[PDB]
Design a protein around this ligand. Structure first.
Ligand SMILES: [Zn+2]
Lengths: 1135, 349
């Protein structure tokens, strides 16, 4: 009844576990990184990481360890899913095709059992005799490893100790022994068991039950010859080996808790340790006692190698290179030149992988192109929080720069034997034309003998017959190749100035006034072939190849496109293209894998058309609005097939994917004229020039999202956009320590201590207050700021710091009431540790004027303002449990208008029109309507279902979307039936889906251009969402017939496509919860449908063996495997 | 008597047919023993037959006593039974404990005299920790806290609770909400707060008296706290432990009028005026109290505080003493140091 369609416009980026081994080949050193579902296999080389494969698994990688069972060459890969799907994958490549086959697959869930709060632990015997798994408390599930165990048949073993923290398998033992730390009322102990597969029960461990620190965090099993185990907590590392027991309490690991570890030596003599605050230690084992050949520990020194990103999974590659994979920071590659000591730190960063981190709030802003949105997200946390600006455009990597005096056209000229290289490019100045010759990166301009020195040459291409033609307004000069001297002059009989000249491989047309002349290039000579007259002046002309069967001309006096015979004077067709302005560029292109000719008007708009190579002209009326500036369309050889670059205020690149063109915006401010140049200096480049200067570089493939990061060294919490002020407003938090002198001290220079105009909130509306439990030494205190960040330079213009013990929660920019100016309205909450639920808060209204953040209004409320939105000029606040509506008076003071008291906590406010949607963490979705006649809220609907809800959004007047526990997405719907005046008060739940991600933020908008297309698209609307792992999604509705077609096609693809681990799709996407599981409905997996363009045509045939395809008809043929390509290609453009 | 030790539980979200006890008129929250003496021969025979078969009965909590219509009820399993013929009446005394909560799907009147109802047992859903969806993998090993120390030396255990909040909700900085908000939806934190604000009305040893399970504790607190019946039905309709605990906090923070015990009808003072400048509850102001005796200041804890005996107006029972200043420049002038157990808080309507 909803008919949605959910797709992912950016794969997840937060690394949640990485592991190195010999996976792809017996000699390679791989590196596998799991994100949630994105298992990325890199091969470690000398310079860094060379990606090799990237496979999408149908689950959240919760366990991943490479093991090599005896009798195999390269390692296998055991992967467990958060839905308890266990698979053993093997790498398999056949020359060029790479496949991840599955050697065993099963589901290792139990029918009953509360999952362990410490989470899944997946550990493996060093001898590859078994795989232990802790899923539920007091139960250790052992998987034997046999060649005939293709279903992974596991058995449980009871654990007498319920609260197990960390468990591992020891080294150098006959039977497989496990050692683990467990919590009992006495304290924390470490115990070892032996596991026998025959008996299927635990035995007596090698050691005895010892006693360890009350906060001993984790166990790490030391290899032979050391053996034993190392247990590290917060103040001591203790090594146990039965009769041996070493304990160290170093004074450097006191500040933070070690959370991650790795081993850098094969013999286990040094270990890497990372803690919460992003600091990299190194545990050194001293084996200086070789008393009887064996090796025993003597000392346990802990070094300190410096500071890195906030680590989540260390990994030591070869040659002192460490991959400090970060879950909330950004993945790194630090080099441990432990002899550097540049400033005391032995780590130096090498690379940095993009990580959109915990997206906590986003906003869509029309910043520059005014046609396409740009997403701005508050990414990261703690010392690596930042702002990411995400834009959808074909990126251009510029490698060369040069300054030109407003050059308005360039052309490569070759004056050498043919070597696919041009040693010079002629640029068209205002009056002259200076050609720059650059064997390397030269900038000097050299006048060609065969080209006019100062005549403002217009066309200078690679003419045929081993000649170079430099056609100008005065006369056309053709020079030879080897002689390099003027060998032909083709002057007009009237000696007039040709406005626009068309050049081809061997035929050249010169248009003067309303007359045109066509000539054919001859060896060392120029011969005029024909002349013709036109009704109106020829503003532009270009014949695309040889001999062109047709010639296109734009009438200056009529603004119409006329196609005729290029080697003759016979007209073929004509079309008046609007007539608003004279067209500035007309060309014919083969980028559509066919013959097509499109012309660009002077206003930037291009009317599409489809030409015929042999004979025939069409119209194909279709408007593309490139911008509001003249455009000179060109083509570059360094392309897929041809491409078409349209230089303007908003440059575009037109490329055809299957049967329709796509105009991808370029990543540049504005370009005046571009030309291909596949020269030695920059192979496969495209030299572009603008009103300022010129540059050269390469162009990316297509439509890849580009992310610009702006660091803050703080935790950003919220963000809005104020259009009039051209600036952003972002709440941020900085952590400070309690100082001995009385006050708070900052750890590092953040982005709020380094603002231009830093103020401090002094509007102590209340006074006195209470704090009998005053903060002591060393405690951490969060200090909040409102930052006013610019929209162009992205610098903080103001950092207004709020009061003490004041958590600033919400933030809205709007024009309240009838005021002509905008405001920043921030709702805060005074939180003291003694009090549990805050009782005091504020709604402070700032106004950023003239570079100063002045507090305009003020208001005190008896609670915490959790959320705020705007009605039509009236603020709508949520104070604890009540929803209040504030009307902005003329005297600049918020005035209450109406109240609505809830039994729930009004924690999510989302509105449209007059409908208000109120929610809380317990998924108590509630609806309200504003009655203008009465002024008071009326409760229209209600939906109560106890479960943890993460976000909420309005899709329409009817559908209300939201997120829900265990990473699910749901969609409610109101009305219908209207049976007993009580069903209209209830919200039917129509859509369910297992997204697999924790959605933080929902926001309307889309990242594609607004080409209307008259008929529009089947998908109506677009709702982006942002999650913890760092993916951007997109939910868009669908018509019912489209939903039926795509659901049937989904069921058909499930039988053809092969998953990794052989997880059936419908089980991955089932609405998963700890107590019940129901199939997905009302949601279409965008990734699965868009995968229809990856499978082969032979595989595509049986996907569509017997289908309907509708399309204004019945069941025409079987969709022919081309109608559905059109459908999926249309669906791809949305994200 | 006859003792039954077996424990059985019907499947949740499933229907069952049970008879309705007509003598029972109050809501029996599960876990609360409700002894009943039955003397009607039909009811006695039915109870004996049930005890032979299942010893399971139904109690319907009617919203309106006159209407006798209930949209929810409870199921009770007999724990002890003793049927004896006394004074010509076969009186059966049965001590029963609530087991499950039932919503009355359809109740009809049987010809035997009792009324039979087919009802679907509501499911008491239990939720995972709010941080389990986003908790970092490396921080999994830090979820276990080193026990729960408590002592008079630690007094309020303030530092321990900050440490618990900071360590458990560490990943709340990956989400748009702060940690002090998630601490409002924690089962352990809410149980601790209920214990703390129940110690201010009685000084019982809650370290053993109250259960350590959110479900059991939630029912016990719903049973103990004194309110009217309709809010007990409201607390019963709640389907989750977290929501029930939050509702109980709301009810406890709603009542602020410290009425007398014994009387249970007069208003001694209000929680708003608590002279916490300097056990016993100190109230800066009071009303509807009768002071008698003499200002005997012998062995007074508070310097400059002479006290006299006090009574309500009717109850005439001692509830405390209105300490009076022994110096001209002493504030407060008169503060009532009432006894905690002498007052029963009620909703200030
Ligand atoms: Zn009284």
């Amino acid at each position: 009844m909803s008919y949605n369609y959910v797709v992912t416009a950016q794969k997840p980026t937060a690394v949640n576990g990485c592991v190195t081994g010999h996976f792809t080949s017996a000699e390679d050193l791989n590196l596998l990184i799991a994100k949630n579902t994105r298992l990325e296999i890199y091969v470690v080389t000398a310079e860094g990481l060379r990606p090799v494969k990237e496979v999408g698994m149908y689950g959240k990688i919760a366990v991943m360890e490479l093991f090599r069972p005896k009798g195999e060459s390269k390692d296998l890969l055991f992967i467990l899913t958060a839905k308890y799907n266990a698979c053993i994958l093997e790498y398999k490549q056949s020359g060029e095709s790479i496949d991840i086959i599955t050697r065993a697959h099963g589901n290792v869930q139990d029918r009953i059992g509360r999952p362990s709060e410490t989470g899944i632990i997946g550990i493996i015997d060093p001898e590859c005799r078994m795989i232990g798994l802790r899923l539920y408390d007091g139960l250790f599930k052992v998987i034997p490893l046999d060649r005939d165990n293709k279903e992974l048949k596991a058995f449980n073993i009871r654990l007498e100790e319920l609260h197990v923290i960390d468990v591992k398998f020891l080294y150098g033992c006959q039977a497989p022994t496990i050692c683990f730390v467990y919590q009992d009322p006495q304290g924390r102990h470490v115990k070892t068991y032996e596991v026998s597969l025959r008996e299927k029960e635990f035995n007596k461990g090698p050691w005895k039950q010892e006693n360890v620190e009350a906060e001993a965090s984790m166990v790490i099993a030391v290899p032979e010859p050391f053996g034993g185990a190392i247990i590290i907590g917060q103040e001591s590392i203790t090594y146990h080996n039965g009769d041996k027991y070493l304990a160290i309490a170093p004074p450097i690991i006191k500040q933070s808790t070690i959370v991650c570890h790795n081993r850098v030596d094969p013999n286990g003599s040094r270990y890497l340790l990372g803690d919460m605050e992003g600091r990299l230690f190194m545990l050194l084992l001293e084996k200086e006692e070789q008393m009887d050949g064996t090796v025993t520990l003597k000392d346990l020194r802990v070094e300190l190698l410096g500071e890195t990103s906030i680590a989540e999974c260390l990994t030591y590659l070869d040659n002192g290179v460490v991959f400090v994979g970060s879950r909330l920071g950004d993945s790194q590659l630090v080099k441990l030149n432990v002899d550097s000591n540049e400033q005391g730190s032995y780590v130096v960063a090498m690379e940095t992988f993009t990580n959109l981190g915990p997206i906590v709030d986003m906003c869509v802003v029309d910043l520059e192109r005014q046609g396409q949105g740009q997403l701005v997200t508050c990414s990261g946390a703690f010392k690596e929080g930042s702002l990411r600006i995400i834009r959808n455009g074909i990126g251009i990597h510029e490698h060369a720069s040069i300054d030109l005096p407003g050059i308005k056209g360039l052309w490569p000229l070759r004056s050498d034997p043919n070597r696919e290289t041009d040693d010079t490019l002629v640029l068209s100045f205002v009056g002259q034309t200076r050609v720059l010759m650059l064997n390397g990166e030269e900038v000097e301009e050299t006048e060609l003998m065969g080209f006019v020195d100062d005549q403002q040459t217009f066309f200078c291409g690679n003419v045929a017959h081993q000649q170079l033609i430099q056609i100008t307004s005065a006369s056309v000069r053709l020079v030879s190749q080897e002689p390099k001297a003027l060998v032909s002059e083709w002057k007009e009989p009237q000696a007039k100035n040709i406005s626009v000249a068309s050049c081809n491989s061997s035929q050249v047309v010169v248009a003067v006034g309303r007359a045109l002349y066509y000539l054919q290039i001859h060896p060392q000579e120029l011969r005029q072939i024909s002349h013709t007259e036109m009704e109106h002046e020829v503003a532009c002309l270009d014949i695309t190849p040889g001999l062109s069967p047709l010639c296109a001309i734009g009438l200056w006096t009529d603004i119409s496109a006329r196609i005729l015979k290029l080697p003759s004077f016979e007209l073929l067709h004509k079309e008046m293209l609007g007539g608003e302005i004279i067209p500035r560029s007309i060309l014919m292109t083969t980028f559509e894998s066919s013959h097509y000719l499109l012309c660009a008007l002077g206003d930037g708009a291009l009317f599409y058309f489809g030409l015929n190579i042999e004979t025939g002209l069409l119209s194909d009326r279709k408007k593309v609005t490139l911008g509001t500036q003249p455009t000179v369309l060109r083509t570059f050889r360094s392309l897929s097939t041809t491409n078409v670059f349209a230089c303007s205020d908003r440059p575009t690149v037109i490329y055809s994917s299957n049967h329709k063109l796509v105009f991808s915006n370029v990543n540049l401010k504005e370009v005046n004229y571009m030309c291909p140049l596949n020269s030695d200096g920059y192979p496969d480049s495209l030299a572009l020039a603008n009103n300022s200067t010129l540059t050269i570089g390469t162009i990316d493939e297509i439509q890849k999202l580009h992310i610009r990061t702006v660091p803050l060294y703080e935790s950003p919490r919220k963000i809005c956009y104020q259009e009039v002020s051209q600036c952003f407003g972002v709440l941020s938090s900085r952590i400070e320590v309690q100082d001995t002198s009385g006050g708070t001290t900052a750890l590092r220079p953040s982005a709020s201590t380094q603002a231009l105009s830093s103020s401090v909130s002094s509007s102590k509306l209340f006074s006195s207050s209470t704090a009998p439990h005053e903060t002591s030494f060393g405690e951490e205190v969060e200090v909040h700021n409102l930052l006013i960040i610019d929209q162009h330079t992205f610098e903080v213009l103001h950092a207004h710091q709020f009061l003490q013990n004041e958590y600033a929660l919400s933030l809205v920019s709007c024009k309240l009431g009838k005021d002509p100016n905008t405001y920043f309205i921030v709702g805060t909450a005074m939180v003291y540790p003694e009090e549990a639920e805050p009782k005091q808060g504020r709604i402070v209204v700032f106004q950023y004027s003239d570079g100063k953040l002045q507090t305009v209004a003020e208001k005190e409320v008896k609670g915490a303002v959790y959320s705020m939105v705007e009605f039509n000029g009236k603020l709508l606040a949520s104070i604890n449990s009540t929803v209040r509506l504030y009307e902005w008076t003329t005297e600049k003071e918020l005035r209450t208008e109406c109240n609505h008291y809830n039994n729930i906590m009004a924690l999510y406010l989302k509105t449209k029109g007059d409908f208000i949607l109120v929610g809380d963490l317990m998924r108590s979705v509630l609806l309200l309507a504003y009655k203008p006649m009465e002024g008071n809220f009326e409760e229209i609907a209600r939906d109560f279902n106890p479960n943890w809800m993460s976000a909420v959004e309005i899709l329409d007047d009817d559908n209300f979307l939201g997120a829900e526990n265990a990473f699910n997405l749901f969609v409610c719907q109101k009305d219908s039936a209207a049976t007993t005046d009580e069903e209209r008060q209830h919200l039917q739940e129509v859509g369910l889906f297992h997204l697999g991600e924790f959605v933080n933020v929902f926001c309307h908008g889309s990242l594609v251009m607004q080409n209307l297309g008259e008929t529009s698209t089947p998908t109506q609307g677009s709702v982006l969402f942002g999650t913890v792992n760092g993916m951007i999604g997109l939910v868009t509705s669908l018509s019912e017939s489209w939903y039926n077609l795509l659901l049937d096609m989904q069921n058909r693809l499930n039988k053809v496509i092969k998953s990794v681990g052989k997880i059936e799709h419908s089980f991955w996407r089932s609405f998963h919860t700890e107590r019940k599981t129901e199939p997905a409905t009302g949601f279409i997996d965008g990734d699965l449908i868009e995968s229809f363009l990856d499978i082969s045509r032979p595989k595509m045939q049986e996907v569509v063996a017997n289908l309907q395809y509708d399309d204004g008809s019945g069941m025409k043929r079987e969709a022919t495997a081309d109608d559905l390509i059109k459908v999926v290609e249309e669906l791809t453009r949305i994200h | 008597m006859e003792e039954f030790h077996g424990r059985t539980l019907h499947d949740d979200d499933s229907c069952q047919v049970i008879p309705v006890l007509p003598q029972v008129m109050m809501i029996l929250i599960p876990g609360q023993t409700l002894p009943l003496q039955l003397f009607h021969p039909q009811e006695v025979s039915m109870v004996r037959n049930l005890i032979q078969k299942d010893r399971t009965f139904a109690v319907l909590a009617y919203s309106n006593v006159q209407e006798r219509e209930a949209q929810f009820g409870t199921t009770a399993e007999i724990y002890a039974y003793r049927e004896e013929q006394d004074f010509g009446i076969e009186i059966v005394k049965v001590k029963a404990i609530g087991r499950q909560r039932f919503k009355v799907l359809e109740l009809r009147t049987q010809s035997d005299g009792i009324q039979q109802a087919k009802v679907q047992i509501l499911p008491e859903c239990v939720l995972p920790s709010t941080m389990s969806a986003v908790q970092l993998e490396s921080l999994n090993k830090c979820q276990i806290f080193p026990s729960k120390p408590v002592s008079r030396e630690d007094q309020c255990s303030y530092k321990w609770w900050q440490k618990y909040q900071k360590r458990k909700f560490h990943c709340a900085n990956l989400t748009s909400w702060p940690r002090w908000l998630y601490s409002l939806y924690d089962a352990e934190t809410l149980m601790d707060r209920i214990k703390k604000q129940l110690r201010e009305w009685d000084e019982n040893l809650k370290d053993d008296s109250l259960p350590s399970n959110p479900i059991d504790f939630s029912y016990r607190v719903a049973a103990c706290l004194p309110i009217d019946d309709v809010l007990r039905i409201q607390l019963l309709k709640i389907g989750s432990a977290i929501q029930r605990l939050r509702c109980e906090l709301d009810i406890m923070n709603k009542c602020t009028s410290l009425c007398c015990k014994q009387c249970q009808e007069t208003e001694i003072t209000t929680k708003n005026e608590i002279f916490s400048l300097s056990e016993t509850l100190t109230v800066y102001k009071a009303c509807n109290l009768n002071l008698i005796g003499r200002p005997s200041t012998e062995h007074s804890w508070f310097p400059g505080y002479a006290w006299t005996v006090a009574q309500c107006k009717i109850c005439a029972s001692h509830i405390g003493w209105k300490f009076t200043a022994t110096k001209k420049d002493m504030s407060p002038q008169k503060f009532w140091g009432l006894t905690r157990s002498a007052l029963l808080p009620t909703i200030p309507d």
